[PDB]
Amino acid sequence: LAGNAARDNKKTRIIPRHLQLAVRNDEELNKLLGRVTIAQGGVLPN
Amino acid sequence: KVLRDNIQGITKPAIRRLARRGGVKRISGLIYEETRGVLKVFLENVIRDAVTYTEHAKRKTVTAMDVVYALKRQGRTLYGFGG
Amino acid sequence: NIQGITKPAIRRLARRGGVKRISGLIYEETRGVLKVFLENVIRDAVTYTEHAKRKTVTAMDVVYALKRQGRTLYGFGG
Amino acid sequence: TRKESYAIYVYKVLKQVHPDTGISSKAMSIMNSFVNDVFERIAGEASRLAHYNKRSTITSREIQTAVRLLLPGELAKHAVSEGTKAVTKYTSA
Amino acid sequence: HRYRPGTVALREIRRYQKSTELLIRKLPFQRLVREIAQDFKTDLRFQSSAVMALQEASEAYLVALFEDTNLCAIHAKRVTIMPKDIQLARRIRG
Amino acid sequence: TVALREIRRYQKSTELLIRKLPFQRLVREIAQDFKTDLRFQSSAVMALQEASEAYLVALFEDTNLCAIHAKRVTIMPKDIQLARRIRG
Amino acid sequence: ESYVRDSQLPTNIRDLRIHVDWKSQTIILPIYGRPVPFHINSYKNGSKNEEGEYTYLRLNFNSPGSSGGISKKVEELPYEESADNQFVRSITLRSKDGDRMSETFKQIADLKKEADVVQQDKLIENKTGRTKRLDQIFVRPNPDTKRVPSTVFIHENGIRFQSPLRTDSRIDILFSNIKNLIFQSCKGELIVVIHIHLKNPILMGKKKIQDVQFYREASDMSVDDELEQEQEERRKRAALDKEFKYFADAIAEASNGLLTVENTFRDLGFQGVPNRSAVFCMPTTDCLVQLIEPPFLVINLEEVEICILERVQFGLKNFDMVFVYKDFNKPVTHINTVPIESLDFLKQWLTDMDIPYTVSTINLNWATIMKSLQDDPYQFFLDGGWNFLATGSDDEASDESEEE
């Protein structure tokens, strides 16, 4: 999921923004890691 | 020595930019001091647990590991610092 | 089934909560919330039993499930 | 000093899932702490389950139920399938 | 005498706050729980104390949620709770 | 109208809004109460700051939601204590 | 004008307290012992300050830099008669010496506020053999808060909504004033509806309205398994549907194919939010509308230049989109909550319309671009056109290495 987000961003490397974006957006893994905060993740558009 | 107004070091524009990252549109004036207080209470909670871990460790430095461990007790685990 | 949790009983719960006036859609929406929470607890309870190799939902397993959920219960288990 | 890192294996997993993609050291630390956290979660759940059923040894059954509990639905299904396949290949070998 | 609207409701608020009794009926709730548990493992039996535990856990959850719902309504400057309040409360709870 | 953008710019960025050194001094200030001569790791200071950042962001989300319920587009302090108490 | 002759004096000849007149919509002030009247339409605002014992009242007129945000602009009263001529902007006073000043200041506060339609051609009513009439029709916006049932008729030079079923009042709509007539059926909708969008809004009932609609409800929820209810509902929907289609053909022949009715493209529709409410968009032949629930807004596609998609990133089930028009005087609308799966449908639709589109993630004002482009329509093409939204150099990010 992180690489997929990175491919949307066009950047080859995965960054914690991509990591947090995937986690928050995917419902299932968002339930697994809801209490977690990803450092420098940011917040999703809304 | 002694420090003061460090919680006032949190700036009004910083609070407004935080609220806007969080989605707020128009911000009332009274928001700033209370957000400062909320941040303050959260920081004594975290720092108390971290310093307690260090006093157990017989160490004079508050390691990022102990920080993470305190956050884990608070139930707001963060990934990326130490391990 | 979920309809058995009826309007007088929802009103009694809301009055325990503090509510004075109650809207009508409250009953249906609260029924839905009860459905959801009961599913969440029971899944963990029955999973605990399948580990235990028992065919009955023990109250101890219920307490462990509520502990996992975080909505801990005291008294009906050791 | 030796440092206990899942990073060496996580990089292999990253290349197999996505060959050309690379990883920042910051994201790599995210993954290392992630694997540590999930490992501790599952292992602790297995330990509590061993105590609860009075078993003195953790086994694949304890781990799979711990996965069933901690993971939510879809990841729980896929994880238990992949894990039972994994112990199956290990035992068949 | 014909009680004005709201007074009897306030009386019940005091009454059931004082009481320490189960406000959902045991066999309807047991039937409900069994209906949920059909899906996960069919023909599953229940320890009765376990059923009591599910019941009081649900009671605590719904009572606290109605407290949050009423707080949402009073914040909304409306005495009557609306479903809006229940969604707001659960969304804040997360 | 720039207010409406000003939501949407910082949402993308991963930057830490709170300035680094006033947070360091605040953190050491709070530390002094529980113990002195404490020499924090810089990593520890950033770890504190990121968690604080996220906590406040979630708080303001809940606050704006409370206001939208109230039919108020302005966050008022009542929103803050309401969110804090419902979160518990 | 304030006054016209000497015969009409102020309320008192010795005006030793600052006087405010209500009948002639003006007030007098003495600037140091000799009079002057000024007008409410010539006024902007007033303000107060109290300091120690001294008091300072400020009164601001309507003038350049005061009534208008930017000078040298075009406004009705000051500029239109003379654009390069002396006016006054604001004055002050101090009347601590008498306890009569707060009274006149509050009379100012309400006098500033104390003080509107293009009239269409009268629609000629003719009861010919070809007469259109259908009942249980409700008009929206209604004349009064309560809901008005009545009938609707077509004539040769406008649309007439006859109230006599309710109150005999007459409302007239001019054919030239109608811009777009569109039908929307009950296919997945809770109403069956006829919308007429007008270019010259009309004053009716209690207020001024541009959008006019007539519909019939299709509600099924009741608060009072049987197949009789389902059969009755299906019969009602289908029979009234043939009635509506016949009526649409009738008005089509009445208009002789000029005022065409567009067919909803339900396949192309999507759950948008242009009016800050969950509404299902439904594109049409030449005018996209979202005509299910209020508040009800119509966007004319003839005056749309291009479209720009904002919030372009994965995991965005809501992303925004901008209509860049050919005329920028009117405000810009924002459809929100566009589904990801509907992006291909939007692209195909825009290609069919032959309108070039842009996809991007950056944000600037709409306000400053509108102001600058009214100032000069070509300045933005000079500074690079709509390619500026494309990012060429934002930042650089990387990492040292990751190996062990």
UniProtKB/Swiss-Prot annotation, chain A:
The modification N6-glutaryllysine is found at residue 31. The modification N6-(2-hydroxyisobutyryl)lysine is found at residues 10-11, 31. The modification N5-methylglutamine is found at residue 40. The modification N6-succinyllysine is found at residue 31. Disulfide bonds: none annotated. It is found in: Nucleus; Chromosome. Following DNA double-strand breaks (DSBs), it is ubiquitinated through 'Lys-63' linkage of ubiquitin moieties, leading to the recruitment of repair proteins to sites of DNA damage. H2AK119Ub and ionizing radiation-induced 'Lys-63'-linked ubiquitination are distinct events. Glutamine methylation at Gln-40 (H2AQ104me) by FBL is specifically dedicated to polymerase I. It is present at 35S ribosomal DNA locus and impairs binding of the FACT complex. The nucleosome is a histone octamer containing two molecules each of H2A, H2B, H3 and H4 assembled in one H3-H4 heterotetramer and two H2A-H2B heterodimers. The octamer wraps approximately 147 bp of DNA. Core component of nucleosome. Nucleosomes wrap and compact DNA into chromatin, limiting DNA accessibility to the cellular machineries which require DNA as a template. Histones thereby play a central role in transcription regulation, DNA repair, DNA replication and chromosomal stability. DNA accessibility is regulated via a complex set of post-translational modifications of histones, also called histone code, and nucleosome remodeling. Belongs to the histone H2A family. This is Histone H2A type 1. It comes from Xenopus laevis. The lineage of its organism: Eukaryota, Metazoa, Chordata, Craniata, Vertebrata.
Swiss-Prot record, chain B:
Belongs to the histone H4 family. It comes from Xenopus laevis. The modification N6-(2-hydroxyisobutyryl)lysine is found at residues 12, 25, 40, 58, 60, 72. The modification N6-succinyllysine is found at residues 12, 58, 72. The modification N6-methylated lysine is found at residue 1. The modification N6-lactoyllysine is found at residues 12, 58, 72. Its main location: nucleus. One of its GO terms (molecular function) is DNA binding. GO terms for cellular component: nucleosome; nucleus. The modification N6-methyllysine is found at residue 1. The keyword DNA damage does not apply. Keywords: Acetylation, Chromosome, Citrullination, DNA-binding, Hydroxylation, Isopeptide bond, Methylation, Nucleosome core, Nucleus, Phosphoprotein, Ubl conjugation. There is a cross-link at residue 72 (Glycyl lysine isopeptide (Lys-Gly) (interchain with G-Cter in ubiquitin)). This is Histone H4. Demethylation is performed by JMJD6. Monomethylated, dimethylated or trimethylated at Lys-1 (H4K20me1, H4K20me2, H4K20me3). Monomethylation is performed by KMT5A/SET8. Trimethylation is performed by KMT5B and KMT5C and induces gene silencing.
UniProtKB/Swiss-Prot annotation, chain E:
The modification N6-glutaryllysine is found at residues 18, 41, 77, 84. The modification N6-crotonyllysine is found at residue 18. The modification N6-(2-hydroxyisobutyryl)lysine is found at residues 18, 26, 41, 84. Its main location: nucleus. GO terms for cellular component: nucleoplasm; nucleosome. The modification Phosphoserine is found at residues 19, 48. The keyword Flavoprotein does not apply. The modification N6,N6,N6-trimethyllysine is found at residues 18, 41. It comes from the Eukaryota. One of its GO terms (molecular function) is protein heterodimerization activity. The modification N6,N6-dimethyllysine is found at residue 41. The modification N6-succinyllysine is found at residues 18, 41, 84. It is found in: Nucleus; Chromosome. The modification Phosphothreonine is found at residues 42, 69. The modification N6-methyllysine is found at residues 18, 26, 41, 84. A lipid is attached at residue 72 (S-palmitoyl cysteine). Core component of nucleosome. Nucleosomes wrap and compact DNA into chromatin, limiting DNA accessibility to the cellular machineries which require DNA as a template. Histones thereby play a central role in transcription regulation, DNA repair, DNA replication and chromosomal stability. DNA accessibility is regulated via a complex set of post-translational modifications of histones, also called histone code, and nucleosome remodeling. This is Histone H3.2. The chain holds residues 40 to 133 of 136 of the full protein.
UniProtKB/Swiss-Prot annotation, chain G:
Signal peptide: none annotated. The modification Phosphoserine is found at residue 219. Changing residue 356 to L: In spt16-6; induces a spt phenotype characterized by depletion of many mRNAs. It comes from the Eukaryota. Changing residue 35 to L: In spt16-4; induces a spt phenotype characterized by depletion of many mRNAs. Residues 101-120 form a coiled coil. It is found in: Nucleus; Chromosome. Forms a stable heterodimer with POB3. The SPT16-POB3 dimer weakly associates with multiple molecules of NHP6 (NHP6A or NHP6B) to form the FACT (yFACT or SNP) complex. The FACT complex interacts with the CK2 (casein kinase II) complex subunits CKA1, CKA2, CKB1 and CKB2 and the components of the transcription machinery CHD1, CTR9, PAF1 and CDC73. The FACT complex interacts with the PAF1 complex. Interacts with POL1. Interacts with SAS3. Interacts with YTA7. Present with 18500 molecules/cell in log phase SD medium. Component of the FACT complex, a general chromatin factor that acts to reorganize nucleosomes. The FACT complex is involved in multiple processes that require DNA as a template such as mRNA elongation, DNA replication and DNA repair. During transcription elongation the FACT complex acts as a histone chaperone that both destabilizes and restores nucleosomal structure. Belongs to the peptidase M24 family. SPT16 subfamily. This is FACT complex subunit SPT16. It comes from Saccharomyces cerevisiae (strain ATCC 204508 / S288c) (Baker's yeast). The chain holds residues 536 to 968 of 1035 of the full protein.
